Amino acid sequence: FKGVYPAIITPFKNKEVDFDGLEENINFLIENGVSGIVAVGTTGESPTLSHEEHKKVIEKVVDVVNGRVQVIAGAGSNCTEEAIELSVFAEDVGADAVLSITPYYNKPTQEGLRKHFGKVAESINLPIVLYNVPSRTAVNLEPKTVKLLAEEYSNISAVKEANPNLSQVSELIHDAKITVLSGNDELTLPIIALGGKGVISVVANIVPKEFVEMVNYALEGDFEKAREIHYKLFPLMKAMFIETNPIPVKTALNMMGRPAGELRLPLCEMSEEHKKILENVLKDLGLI
Amino acid sequence: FKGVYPAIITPFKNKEVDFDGLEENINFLIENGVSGIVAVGTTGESPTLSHEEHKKVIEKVVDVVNGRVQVIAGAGSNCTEEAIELSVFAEDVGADAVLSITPYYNKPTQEGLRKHFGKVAESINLPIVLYNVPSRTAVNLEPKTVKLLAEEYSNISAVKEANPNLSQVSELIHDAKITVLSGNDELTLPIIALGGKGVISVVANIVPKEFVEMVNYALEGDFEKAREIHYKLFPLMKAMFIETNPIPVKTALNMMGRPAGELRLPLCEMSEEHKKILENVLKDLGLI
Amino acid sequence: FKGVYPAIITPFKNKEVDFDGLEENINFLIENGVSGIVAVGTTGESPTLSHEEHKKVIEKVVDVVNGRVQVIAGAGSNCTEEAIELSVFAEDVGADAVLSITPYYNKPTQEGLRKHFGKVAESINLPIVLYNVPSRTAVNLEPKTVKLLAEEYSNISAVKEANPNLSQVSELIHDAKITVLSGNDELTLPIIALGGKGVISVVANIVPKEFVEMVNYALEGDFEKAREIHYKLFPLMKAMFIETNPIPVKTALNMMGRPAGELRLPLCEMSEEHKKILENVLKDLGLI
């Protein structure tokens, strides 16, 4: 795993997944140089997709990409048995990897997380991206735990790290001997300087070419040029979290006239104050 | 809503729900004076129950209780369509009310929270208990949002408040359109002192009788007698969070030889260290 | 220690301590039922008094009170040498107790705190009220450290507890080593329910009579009547922290035409937005 992997939105139309818009979105991202696509993660609205829709979206992404970039299937759950069914499906349907979130809400212990991901890792042969986002899940996947997992299971391959405490990123790089992927667009630059190898990205849905450029300069070690793009995208990056992801990214795509449509409850339209702000940021970049 | 409402565990035996054990537990609680039972909440491991088991547990609680005390059924979800469907089922199956958790993990705005709970309120005629636990969900249901909800829908009746900042409870009581139930055993006494009317409780699975008396003292305004049971049980209350609920409560029940059985992954067995502490707490109380 | 001790403001006039206003304020609070006076704490702007103003304000409080009620002198500092000096001064000048805050900013360890408070307790024969407020000091004085202090030093007699996690208060009460005084006006009712014996108060500066009545109702165990006043005063109690104390309380006292005067930098006049909220709260109470 290296470079930019947009966490793609799931577009909706007439209350159903918009499979055609999906294809068009995927092809857009591929023309602009992304290394891969993460299907049905948080930005894909996994919580509000039926079991059956989650499967059809993954299959659609696998079928459209048709090997041109890595397809990473969202397969996390806070129920271990479900995380297994999903991971096995991702392998069977032809995904190249699995993104597996730490169980949210039920708050397992570190031993719980170890056991949980261990089952997941044993269930499939695919590379697994562990996904840590304490601010949403109420649990922090500790580096020592990842080190144990990584040393037991060769397919445990990377961490998408969205803990904003970057000394966790140092511990992972130093002790854990795992690939770190940024889980926060705005921390991608400093995480890559730390040893990080890429990013699973929200904003790359909107500006894939520029984000790909930025990340490529950061990987090459050209931070002067990376910073230039970072600072240019900086207001857009802030606007991506002006309300909870994916409310902003879908709003922005609608404003640009790209496929996205409605958010599913309990997610809902941005405030007007917030819209105008995003509106202005998009205008400043000449995106609309 | 008034008094002690144990949030019951879901006992397991041979990877299946222990229906006889459930029945044994319910009658134990009823016989010790609880006002009602909360089925398949987070203490009942709802995250790791199948859709089928969820419905079967609630049906069994309804049928065993047989109108004797209130049955409040867990029916929340971070997907609104799923919340509506669970709530409809609880009504159709004969439950007296619905416990509805704020969407966890996807972090809806206050407006999205209001829309989510509105859809739930509109789907059923049963009284609804809203459930706020920011330390698990990563979202705080604000008192002004409860106020707007209780104003719009007459079946929005109570809030199980587990926010540990008791100014939020004072604000709920002040902006007075709902009954406040303690969502934390150890804060039950000060929450009733503030004007709370009961508790949805973990510890009441273990010491139903004593907790019922404490609460009744607090409700009567006799805090000297209430404090005396609070303090007797204080070490027990702490041990109930020595690891993530329901790990300790199930552990404790197994210890006492009562129906409980295993935890489902990613929840797992307590530390040897932590069990020793729990064991000793239990022993000092003559429960083992 | 029992009942209501206002932490009095230090009024200023023409850039100097307003000793007459001070006298007038003290007399007003005594006439309206307070149990004592806390001089030159945080609410009295101790960080912005010179060393000589600090000693003078305390001397004046001692002199005006003239033994009528207990005088508790702010002493204490994040430098142990200064804390001893301040404490020995309080004794020499005729105060009845000392209020001693945990060192702020320099973050000593629990062992550091024990040694700091030990040196203070050895330096004087007066009773000492420990002051814990992690939200300001960046340090939490653990109940086990209090237990240890109280066991070694018989003049460590109380803790002013401003940690809003009321489990910490339950722990302090369970050890029964020490009197608990509320450090937060709005948590006074629930803290007394838990076994607290009173409050070091901000809002008592504004409504001494009403707050004294609330607190006595609570100490007698009449929570029905305690609740009535707590809810009557709730919007005021919130207004008291709408910005950092003592900016609201001095603002309210000036609006009321009582001695208070200017705030010393870095504290400064409240926002116009916050002034409007406070003024309406004072008007609702008939205080302006």
Add this chain to the structure above:
Amino acid sequence: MFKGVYPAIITPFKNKEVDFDGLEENINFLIENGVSGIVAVGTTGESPTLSHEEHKKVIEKVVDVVNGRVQVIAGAGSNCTEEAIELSVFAEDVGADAVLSITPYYNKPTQEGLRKHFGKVAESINLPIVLYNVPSRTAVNLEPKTVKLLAEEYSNISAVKEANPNLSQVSELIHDAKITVLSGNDELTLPIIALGGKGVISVVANIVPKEFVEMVNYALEGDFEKAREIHYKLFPLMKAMFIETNPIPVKTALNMMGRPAGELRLPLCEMSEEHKKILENVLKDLGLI
């Protein structure tokens, strides 16, 4: 401007008194090793536990010993505005090159209170001023909007030592401020420079000045492959520097290495036996013994 590595020097004590000879010897050690400047009597220097007179004499000793070879930044912050002015005026009068000025701690002023506070400091002197933000100690966060107003009004508001570990605060400063950002966290120094910061005010540069200077110069020149190598080699040491509250670990470490430090002043006190051993092993691993 401010650039490169500025250690926040300890104040060494001998027999309950500031150890001036030890202080001199520490200063020359750091200068020998290529530091850009010295930060005197900040938190690492136990500013809370020094007398007024010790504070003054310590800054005086630092100015004199340094003798213009490197920049001297004098800690002169207080949570009392009148005292912050006084300390600042003194730093200028005595010959320091710059003032470090911490957001008032404990009393929790509002943003506007902070602006007015730093405004009075800035009006009091002509020295460049480094604003120090460290919410984990002060209970307050100086917002980039507030820094931007300061810098727009006062030409001598020159840098921020940023110890807030939320690094998008750092990119908000780089993006909006026009102030120099200095790292306030040894372990975040490398990612802060990547974001465009220009150096660090450092605890660990007291122990390994030559290594830190060179890691920083690599990160400054944009050679992150080599910055990373030194960052990870020092990573256990950087964590040890906060194993207990700074400056407990750094002084414990200097004493272990037989360099001037001596005792901590209450309420600071000796490290636990368990923490001592962890520190010792990391010192042993780097061969600092």
